[model samples]
Target: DVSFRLSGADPSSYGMFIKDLRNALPHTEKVYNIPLLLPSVSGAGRYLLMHLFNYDGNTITVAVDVTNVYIMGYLALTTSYFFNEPAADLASQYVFRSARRKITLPYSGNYERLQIAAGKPREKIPIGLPALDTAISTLLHYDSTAAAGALLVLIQTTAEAARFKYIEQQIQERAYRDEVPSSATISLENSWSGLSKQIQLAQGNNGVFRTPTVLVDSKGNRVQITNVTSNVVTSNIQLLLNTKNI
Candidate 1:
């Protein structure tokens, strides 16, 4: 009957905290629940304690948190040898790269231009011909006439607080870069042009320091939300936290 106990103002105090924690860390596996044991008091019926434990062959264990219990259980299923050295070390050194792919503009144009030239008719001798045509024009034209730029959808996605937080911080910095020093060479507009359209989005505010705006639909004779489809994407991610060892 190995056990450990915790006393509180009431079970609801700890219970509500755990509940909110689950809500906040919504990625936790749903099946696992904190076992709130029946509280018993020796003399005073009002004073009681809650308990929790787990049993392994000839051994019962008490743990500090859900994370520890989960990690131990995971190790039990994974490694047959009792020593957790190699497995633990491997898990420690490795960071799992997410399966999702990231989309970004390649800095160079060699391969990008090749992709654009796949099916176009041009003076290219693919057969047994040596330096065939210099007279034929090989000017590559940009496809976009009007300046609506493209968005690169990120490949990897994560809900893990730290990783997602880092990415969100990076995106916030990009928003800042949208309106900084006017003569900066590496402008955000170099990647996408719609970001530069402050004049149309500006509502008579001060020039050169206007805040960015989202386009409002004017088709209904009034300002309304537009149903834009290109602006949405979904991502799947896995999370790992290191407090699991008991």
Candidate 2:
């Protein structure tokens, strides 16, 4: 249903982006490398979602037309989400295929990198338009997403997990310096006592290695946090939860 033509594609900078992604995908998963440019079936819009494929604790073998480049790139993004971000890769996010959608599928490969990982300058990925992050965030939960998606019951829970993990670490660091917040915080049921215990894990020797800074929130466009700003170290732990869902 969805197919992107190389010559017809724009943002001239991305001419080679798809190719590069195809090369990089083998590092993590199995790419069938189809010869025909016909778009694959509806894992789709020709999407072929995560867990919809075979995962061997590592590489996931996905089949789609790679010559088209766009589908090729799209698959790689899905591959990383399923195998890398377990919290974001829950079946709750990608199981059902009903009348749910916020973004279009069959887009690009490096879009995730360009948006989330600070990938090298190539093409600008779409964000802020429909306000939603991307088709990936809408249906697949790309690792690069910054906020909770529409499947509130599903997507937000995963987002909560990511933020919870981030906060747990943040609290871990703050706790080390005794920067722990007070019991005046949100109620965790029978007092903060048990929640207090929930926060601790074997004390670690390290904390806060990399930071996110700028994060995209909701398809409801808005600039959040800051990737590069002085007097703003808070950007590092960027996780956007959709309270609208909660």
Candidate 3:
């Protein structure tokens, strides 16, 4: 059996870590308890004993001797991948592009515009009410105006994160272009404005920087919490750590 220390910086994360460990080792046959001593704190940590059986034809016995480990250090991370070619050769040959890719548009003018040009007026027809045509005529215009306003708010609200991410990416890409003297130019679209202010739902604005966590209300409003806070301490670590494999 192989052994590794499981740890987290807080209770919630520690609890999630234990659950994941149990899930990973599904077939347990035995149990053991042992006192675990840590260098950071003077208290004795809780432990769990587990003897896990193999699921595959391969004869493997998995086990967990102790668990619920806590740590007092930052959990920094880096990604690793296999490179078929040598690192030096790969760097020298590749012109790495760090900027986000261009977005694909299926068709132009795919969204509703905030305003439209006035077309030729339609002939007025009576509907038994005085100036009924006038009221009906303005109804379309009024509805369009309201829709445009809501659409603008929705677009801006949803694109806030994407805009910031794109800006930071462009900045980095511009630096690379300036330093390397590249022939490529960064293209930007000019239709949408990011300056307008509208109703903003709960956006997690804590000082601590980590991955974003979005909370959606029953009313379908979204609040992005960008910083780690007390709520995160009690949240499931597995969900917080969820991401597309890099």
Candidate 4:
């Protein structure tokens, strides 16, 4: 069972934090009466405690705090993960390039632009409303114009916590490159729905557990809160303790 209690620096983040928390645990598993501890005055250096059930099948209360934002169990994190800002561009790694279609072709222009060269005339482009409409909407998904950013977290198991220790930074720092093409072929929305399904199951596809991933904008808006999956290796996420993870 999970019950949350908040105190200190993360007043704004508490919202997003609690959001991911509720999403992570099941209805029966979460303690709702605790509700949210009303905002308290700033820091004794703030902390958030999570009574998490790790993959090992053992249950423990993981403390999330500003003492370098460390995790008491298998992995660790910082307040930066909880820091909420207006959602920026959805990083390329999240969108499998292969799933992208040629509706709005790049470099040489798409069917709409090429139609003009065929003497089809430019007005015929938007005049062909459906094409441009669909094109623009698809662009919104891949474009940085999105209003929120997200964290694809896996906190259910220690193995995954260990896996997260390896993968989190890769998701942020490196490129998926071949892994993008290496995985099975799938649609774009599949990424979002694929995630929605996984978090509920407490298992990941090809190593990603969607159990607590969240999407929120900086305005305290749940933007696509109604929405969105979909790895790890190398500890690029430097865990800092007293300014040292060494």
* Model 4 lDDT per residue over 107-187, tens place: 122223233333442222221112212222332333221101101121211112221232222222211111211011111
Runs in model 2 with CA error above 4 Å? 1-69, 72-96, 99-246
TM-score of each: 0.15, 0.18, 0.17, 0.18
Q: How many backbone clashes does every candidate have?
A: 2, 9, 3, 8
* Residue 181 alpha-carbon offset, candidate 4, angstroms: 16
Instruction: Estimate, for each residue in 1-246, the C-alpha lDDT of model 3 and write its tens digit.
Output: 121121112333323333454333222231111111121211222222222111221121111112211111000012111112232122212211221221211111113223231211111111111121122223222233433332222222112112223322322333212221111111111211111000011123234434444443224455554433423222212111001111
Could you tell me how far off, in angstroms, the CA of residue 138 lies in candidate 1 after the best superposition?
28
TM-score of 4: 0.18
lDDT of each model, Cα atoms only? 0.20, 0.25, 0.22, 0.25
After superposition, the stretches of candidate 1 with alpha carbons farther than 4 Å from their true spots are 1-26, 30-149, 153-163, 178-246
Candidate rank order under TM-score: 2, 4, 3, 1
What would the TM-score be for candidate 3 when compared with the true structure?
Answer: 0.17
> Which has the better TM-score: candidate 3, or candidate 4?
4
After TM-score superposition, the amount by which residue 34's alpha carbon in candidate 4 deviates from its true location, in angstroms, is 26
